[PDB]
Each structure stands twice: as C-alpha cells, then as structure tokens.
Amino acid sequence: RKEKIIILGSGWGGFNFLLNIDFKKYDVTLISPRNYFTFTPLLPCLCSGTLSVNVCTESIRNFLRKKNGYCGNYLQLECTDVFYEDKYINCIDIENNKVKLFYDYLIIAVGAKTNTFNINGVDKYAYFVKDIDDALKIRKKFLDILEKCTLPNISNEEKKKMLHVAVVGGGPTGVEVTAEFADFINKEVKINYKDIFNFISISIIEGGNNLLPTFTQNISDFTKENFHNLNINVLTNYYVIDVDKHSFHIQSSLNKNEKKKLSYGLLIWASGLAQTTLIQKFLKTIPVQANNAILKVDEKLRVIGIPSNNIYAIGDCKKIQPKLLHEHTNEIIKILTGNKLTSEALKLKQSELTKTFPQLSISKWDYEKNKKGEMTPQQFHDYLFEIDKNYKSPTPTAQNAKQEAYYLSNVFNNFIHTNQKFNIPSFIEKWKGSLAYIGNHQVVADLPYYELKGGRFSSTFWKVVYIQLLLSWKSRFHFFIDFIKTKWYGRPFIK
Amino acid sequence: RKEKIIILGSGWGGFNFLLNIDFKKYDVTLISPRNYFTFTPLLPCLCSGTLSVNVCTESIRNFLRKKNGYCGNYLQLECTDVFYEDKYINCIDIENNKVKLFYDYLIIAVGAKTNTFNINGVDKYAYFVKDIDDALKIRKKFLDILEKCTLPNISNEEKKKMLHVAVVGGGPTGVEVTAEFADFINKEVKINYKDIFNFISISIIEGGNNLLPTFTQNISDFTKENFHNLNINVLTNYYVIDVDKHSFHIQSSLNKNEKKKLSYGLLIWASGLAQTTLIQKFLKTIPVQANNAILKVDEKLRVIGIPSNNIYAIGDCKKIQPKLLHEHTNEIIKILTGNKLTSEALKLKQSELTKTFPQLSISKWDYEKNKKGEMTPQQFHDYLFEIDKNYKSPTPTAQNAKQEAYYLSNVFNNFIHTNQKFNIPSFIEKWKGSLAYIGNHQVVADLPYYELKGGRFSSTFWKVVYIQLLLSWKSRFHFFIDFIKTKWYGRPFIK
Ligand SMILES: Cc1cc2nc3c(=O)[nH]c(=O)nc-3n(C[C@H](O)[C@H](O)[C@H](O)COP(=O)(O)OP(=O)(O)OC[C@H]3O[C@@H](n4cnc5c(N)ncnc54)[C@H](O)[C@@H]3O)c2cc1C
Ligand SMILES: Cc1cc2nc3c(=O)[nH]c(=O)nc-3n(C[C@H](O)[C@H](O)[C@H](O)COP(=O)(O)OP(=O)(O)OC[C@H]3O[C@@H](n4cnc5c(N)ncnc54)[C@H](O)[C@@H]3O)c2cc1C
Ligand SMILES: [Mg+2]
Ligand SMILES: [Mg+2]
Ligand SMILES: [Mg+2]
Ligand SMILES: [Mg+2]
Ligand SMILES: [Mg+2]
Ligand SMILES: [Mg+2]
Ligand SMILES: [Mg+2]
Ligand SMILES: [Mg+2]
C-alpha cells in the first residue's frame, strides 16, 4: 500500500530521479522502451570510436536495489496515453501489446525527439545523433564508405563525392562530431587509407555566423579558426533546405538568392528538438493546454491543468510557467513594508521571495541593469510584470534535467508527506558551465568566472571534469581504460 | 612486377598467412567480405558478455604494413568464381557490382558455413554461433526475452516456455555457450531478475552419448556431471529432426520410435559444417574433382587438377589427399636399408620419407600396433596401401588452419624461387591439445601428456593459455581488462 510513483523515461531526468528517490518511502516503477541510461555528452566520441558503449551507458536494472534493502521496478514499455482523470497510463511493448498501469504520482521525463524541420529527405537520408544506436550507425556508415572507395571499380570523382561528410548544426554536438571525425580522419584513417586520404572532406553547416553560438565570441572565433586550420569547411551562415540521395541544397542566411548544391556520402543531422508523440497527444487532452506546442509546468514542476496536482514533468519535454509576480502585487508589497517601493527593496527580500517566485532570482533578473526608483503600487505592478515576462525556462540540457531530478526526488523524500509539505521551494537551476571538444586536442570551456580556449592542458581539464560527472565507478573505469586503449592502440575499424 | 598472391578469406587461415607472408617478395592482396579476423575460440564468451568484441577481433588493415616498410592490400569483396585457366577470379561488392582480378597464386581460405542438415525450420528460427554478429544477436535475443517475461501481461506457463534456452551440439562450442549462459543466468540474471530466475532453463542436445566426444571419457563424464550439478538439461543421445516457431522436435538415438516435442524461447545451433557456394561452384569446374563434396589438395596443399599448380587451399574448406605410398613401392623399397622388408625398416627411415609422405608420420600411423615382419614386395605394397587408406586429413580447427598458414607462407618465403624449390616438405600438423570451459569456473583440457579436469586453478590455466594465443598486444590488453571488468562490475545488460 505504498504510494506508487511511475517515472516515464530512462534519460537524464528519469534516471537521476530513480537514483535519488527513496525506495523505502515509495513504490517506484520506471517505464522506458530503453533499458539503459545514455550519457549523451560522450556520444560524439562514440561516432569515431574514441570511447566505447560501456562508458556511455548505464543499465537501469543495476540501480534498482539500494543499500538499505529496498527496491524499485523497471518495465520495458513505451507509454502511449496518459489518463489524468482516472490516474493511469496506457503503454505498449515492442510487439504492440497494450498494458494498463495505475499511479499515485506520474513523473514525465520522456525528453524530445529529433527535428527534421519538415525538410524533404532528411528523415530518409540523414543520420541523427541522438542516441547510442545513432552514433554506432554513423561510425559504421563512415567505415563502409572508406572500404567502398578502396575498390577498383570507382573513379576519383565519385570518391570525392562519397567521401564528403556533411554535419548539419553548429552547436556543441555538430561541432564535436565534426571534430571527432577530423581527429579520426587525420590519424587512423590517414595511416590506414593513405591512397584516399586526400579525397576526404568534412563540412559543418550552421544557420548563424558562429560555431558554438551560446559560448563566448572568443570561443566561437577560436573554434572556427581551429576548424580552418584542420581544413574543415565551415559553412556558417547557411542552412539546409532540401536533401536528396547523393546531394543536398543549402541556402545562404545572408542572401536569400544564393543557393549551393553539395554532393555528399554521409549526412549527419545534429540540430533541432521536437516533441514526442506522447506529449502532443497528452497536450490535446488538457483543456488549458490544448493548443500548446510544449508541456507547461508549475514553478514546482507540476503539470498545469491537472486537478489532482499529481503529474510532474522534468527535462526536455517541458517548459516552466511560474506563478506570476504581478498577480500577487499587494502581497509582495506587504512583505516589504518599511522600505519605499524600490527595485532595491525588492532585491533585499530576493532570498525569501525566490522560494516561491523563481523569476526573482539574481540568475534570472538583472537588478543592476533594471534598477528602479521609488514606485507607485501600479508602477510596481508593471515592474513585477516585466520580471514575469523576462523569465526564461531552464534550457534543455542534461545539467538542468539532472538538477530538476534531484530537486523533485528530494521533494518527494523530504517534503511531500512531512511537516514541511507547505514549505516546498520553487525550482531554480544553477549554471555550472559548458565544455566542448573542437579537435586536435583542443578543448574549450565557458564556465562561471573563466573561459578555457585550448592548449596543452585543455584535454586534461576535460577528462578531470567528465570522469567526475559519470554516474558509476564502472563507467569511470571504462573511461580511463578507453583513453589508454585509444592512445596505445588507436581507434578500432571493426564494423 | 612482383608476383601477385591473392588470399581469399580473413579467417584463421587467410589472416595468419597474411601475418607471415613476405610483403617485400610478393604483391599480396587479401580479399574478404569481412574486414576483420575473428578469434573464434572466444566467441562463446561474447554470447554472455564475459568478453568484448575487441578481444575477439583483429582489423585486417592494421597488419598490412610490415616493419621492413613494405605493404599488403585488402579488398572488401566476396569471391564468386575462380577461373583457373585464365588465372583470375570474379568478385562482387556488397552492392553486387562485379570486379575481376588477376593473380599469379591463389590462396583459398574461405572456411565453411553452418550446416542446417536440411532440417525444416532451423535456418528460419535458429541462431547460429559462427561469427561475431551471431554471438551478438544471441546475447541480444536472450536479453530481450528476460525483459519481455518481466512484463505483467504474461502467464507463468508462457514464461517457462519462453525462458527455455536450447543449444544443439555437444561439441566444445555447444558446451561452452551452454556453460556461459549458465554462469550468466546464475550470477547477473539471478540478481537482476529474481522473480523469473526459477522459470529459466537450459538444455543441450547431442546425438551421441558424450558431451565433448573428442576429449577423453573422464572429461566427458566430468562435463555431464558438472552440467547436472548446474541443473542444465543434458539431452545426450538425442538429435533435432524439426524446428517450428515456438517448439522443436527431437528424436532419440537409442530408440527410433521415441520423440519429444519441446517448447523454447531461444534455439542455438552449434553444430555442423557445410561447404561455401564458392567452393561448390569451383568444384564443378574441375574435371577430376567435379563430383566431390569437398575440395582436395595434395600433400603440399595444392588444389588437385589445376595444370598450373598455382592454386592452394588451407583451413576448413579443404581436405588433403597425399601422394600415394603404394604408387611408389619400388622407389620406397630401394630407399630402405635392410636385409628385409619389415615395418621396422620403414619406420627407421620415417624421418626422411615423411618429408614427401605425411601419412608415414608417427602421428598418422601407429607402427607398434601395425608391426609387420619380413614381407615380399607385393605384401609391402599392400602394407603401404593400408597406410595410404589410413591417412586422416587435418581436422577442421583453428590450430590446423594456423599451422597450415605458417607452413605455406614459409614455403612462399623461403622455398619458392630459391635453390630449395624442390626441397619443399609435405605439410604435417602438430596436435597441441584442446581446452573447454564447462561452467562455474571449471576448465577441462585434453593435452598431449595431461588431462585437466576442473579445480580452482583450471581457469587460471585457461587464461595463461589464451592470452598467449591472441595475435596482438591490443587484444591481450583487452583480454586482461575484460576479466577485471567482469569480476568487479559484472556482465553488462546493454542491448
Ligand atoms: C549528442 C548530445 C550531446 C549532448 N551534450 C550535452 C552536454 O554536453 N551538456 C548538457 O547539459 N546537455 C547535453 N545534451 C542534452 C541532454 O542530452 C538532454 O538535455 C537530456 O538528454 C535531457 O534529459 P531528458 O530526461 O529530458 O531526456 P532524455 O535523456 O532524452 O531521455 C528521454 C527518455 O524517455 C524515453 N522515452 C521517450 N518516449 C517515451 C515514451 N513514450 N514512453 C516512455 N519513455 C519514453 C527515452 O527512451 C529516453 O530514455 C546532449 C544531447 C545530445 C543528443
Ligand atoms: C564458436 C567456435 C569456436 C571454435 N573454437 C575453436 C577452438 O577452440 N580451437 C580450434 O582449433 N578451433 C576452434 N574453432 C574452429 C575454427 O574457428 C575453424 O577451424 C577456423 O575458423 C578455420 O579457419 P578458416 O581460415 O578455414 O575459416 P574461417 O576462420 O571461418 O575464415 C573463413 C574466411 O573466409 C571468408 N569468406 C567466406 N566466403 C568467402 C568468399 N566467397 N570470398 C572471400 N572470402 C570468403 C570469411 O568471411 C572468413 O573471413 C571454433 C569455431 C567456432 C565457430
Ligand atoms: Mg528521462
Ligand atoms: Mg539519456
Ligand atoms: Mg531528449
Ligand atoms: Mg523530458
Ligand atoms: Mg581464412
Ligand atoms: Mg576467423
Ligand atoms: Mg569456417
Ligand atoms: Mg578454409
């Protein structure tokens, strides 16, 4: 008769919730068609064979038995419908047999799927980079092309066309996949395929002017230079408008009349998120959310429009729509009485108010740049409203999905059925910074309070960071060993 | 204008020939649809996840550059026809494009394929254990069945049916696959799937009375005992006669009228060799061999019936048909130094005559059990004829394919086109013994002067043997690391 929590998804959100949720307090079942967790940041390393699958994964069932002797459950199912009124979900197994499951709480962490932007042919011809199997197919395809072009029945012209690798997307994933292929090409491939090495090329295609546009401008500039120095074709200010079997078309972002047709052998699609069909269907079921393009939750991560307040959502499948400051003006005015109505008066209570309004965090609202003198009540209401409008939901990252998971699981463990049940603070993420590998041993990092821009100890920093981020000693062992293997014996060619 | 050697196959014969052939003296191309070598003895460990793919393989292209600076070639092709009159072969690539290649010498090492004994349904429903992809599919299937049987939509009766693993073949492969599954089931599976552990069973089906029939009787009995002790169903004296989607039928070897119908979830086919289509086609093309079921070579491993004597064959695809003693009686009589034609007179010159007649080897003919007094020329002829008829071709093992490869490559390196042209000795294999893993840390070995029958140090012996048998430091490193990983973290469940 323990309350039942159903987790949907075995990704950064679902798995980390599982890792922290108290199996003694709750009956927990994780449901996912994928019986492992994927350490997504290392996926580009899998495309080149730098790292192995064991570094990049965790088996869900290895974490179902916690040390206090209490256990969770896992079911290999795809959820297809949620029925919030009757508190159950419909799932299917791999053979499309329906199965019905009841819950007391539902944690939706189903992530997102790849976005083709309805561009003709990318679903058909492009390789996505979202999961382990994608990375493995990409590696395999590249190796198949190398062998094909070593055959006598192929002209040099066809070789140059087949050995062009195009990567679409200038964010960290497109950049790292491109960098890993450049390393592989310049090292193991150059040694083992010397007679076709000169025919190989790589292009990276990006709509904006910058590679790694969310990093600093120095890092973007340094990434483009390092790519130039590696003889990678940087097609910034271009985006894809059509894909066919042996060529694709790109469109200049700077001149709508300029188009280019490019031949290619391998096309890697490393950009864009779209909603899962489950979320699209769930949305239509919620009156308040029926025309939404994304699932909205509370500042406490409760799905909005559910009378029972028993469905949560974390990670990439959702956006936070916090309680509105400006619907609570008089109350906020009340909590700071002595002080005149100034922005500084507001900031003075930021610590307390932030527990219920995340948009008041100094990480969310710049009080220096938006300093405001004494205001009338009505003026203060408008200011509050501007803070509401300025609120940005957590970015769709592993970092945020992990932090949301720890927050929410800790709420179930230590708040929900305790004397602290009315003191649940709102979720506020903390930015810890980002790393990207950009080729030829160069690592960049955009962190709070510093930037890293390549250099001899760049890769050492990367390794120190990621070995601590891995979620088991097993993966850490493999992480360490894989770099020894790669240094001593090189990347493998088994396909 | 170096002479061109084409090697067909990247297995034990082809790869080991490549490893020893002098690239300076010859222009060598290896042709195989498989761009790696498979260390087949460790394949059963791959079915359970004890060892990884990197321990079990070698990429061909990593061995194409020898230290002296000279190089070989590899082409990823399947040979389809040999034209021995015009000295070329036809090949196809994976897209069915034909390619024609000329040679001065052709080394046929294409191995064998699995034999279904034309039993209905085994090609449709059974899993073979012949190569890397086979072992991986078997592992995946087993993991899939476990997850399926954890779902709430399945009766206990259906579970017992689906969790029955049947292995067909009581030789070392069937036994080792069975043993590895038993270890996996008893350790990682028992821990991670407690609620269905008791529904799992394994049967091994074998026509004869003995598991490991080619080992000693003590080892065979010990293997059956160990299997009983592990609660494996030992169905010796049974063979499979039909295979359907969810059940198969077996037939008692002891009573023609007794048949059993068995339910199963995973059926593993670990018995039988058949000829490749290439070799079947090649045969019909050679007058002298047109109605043969196997390719015959002479005592120097030259294909018989080829006017140019420039096609060789090694490994599983061939049988040796040595030059006949009894067609050379008079010459043999003259070589003998004796007052009389005795068996002992023959054995006295055995070390010299064995250079041309392998069937005279003490490993091939038992001179003590067939001792013969003074004979007449005609009687000596009949005796010689008995030795001829007693000759057994090298058994189809990696050990023999490897020794044949080193023999033949050494003949090309040091005998062909030198003043030893006419001093080429016949091939005679050396038996080194065999090892088998039979479960729960028990290793058996049947060696020239010892038998090993389990015990605490038997696994230790197994490891020091195989780490020396591996063909690169890369694989040895992985061999060592995989055992540490499996001991510390267990076998993985990633599928
Ligand atoms: C190549 C790559 C590199 C990345 N690198 C970084 C990085 O360096 N730093 C960073 O912060 N972020 C990184 N990310 C982003 C990060 O992976 C995502 O933000 C994170 O995966 C979000 O976690 P999630 O739990 O919401 O979704 P996911 O981790 O994608 O998990 C979704 C889970 O739900 C399951 N699922 C899907 N549909 C259903 C269904 N209908 N029913 C049940 N289960 C379902 C899926 O099988 C999956 O297990 C990277 C992403 C990629 C693709
Ligand atoms: C599971 C298992 C365990 C084993 N354990 C042992 C053991 O412990 N000890 C032992 O001595 N033996 C063992 N063996 C036997 C050993 O693997 C074989 O005897 C050995 O493989 C024979 O070598 P080969 O070169 O003739 O054939 P293979 O090693 O099979 O190589 C044949 C090669 O030819 C290629 N080929 C096939 N058709 C064509 C074509 N038409 N054109 C070009 N190439 C082609 C194949 O891709 C392959 O690369 C084991 C076998 C298996 C399956
Ligand atoms: Mg998740
Ligand atoms: Mg994931
Ligand atoms: Mg996602
Ligand atoms: Mg999500
Ligand atoms: Mg071979
Ligand atoms: Mg092989
Ligand atoms: Mg074979
Ligand atoms: Mg052969």
Assembly level: homodimer
As a whole number of angstroms, the C-alpha radius of gyration of chain A is 25 Å
The overall strand count of chain A is 25
**Main beta-sheet annotation of chain A:** 5 strands, parallel
What does this structure look like?
The structure is a homodimer of 495-residue chains. The first copy, chain A, is built from 15 helices and 25 strands. Chain A is an alpha/beta fold. In chain A, helix 1 runs parallel beside helix 13 (398-414). The termini of chain A are far apart. Chains A and B meet through helix 4 and helix 15 of A and helix 4 and helix 15 of B. Bound molecules: flavin-adenine dinucleotide (2 copies) and magnesium ion (8 copies).
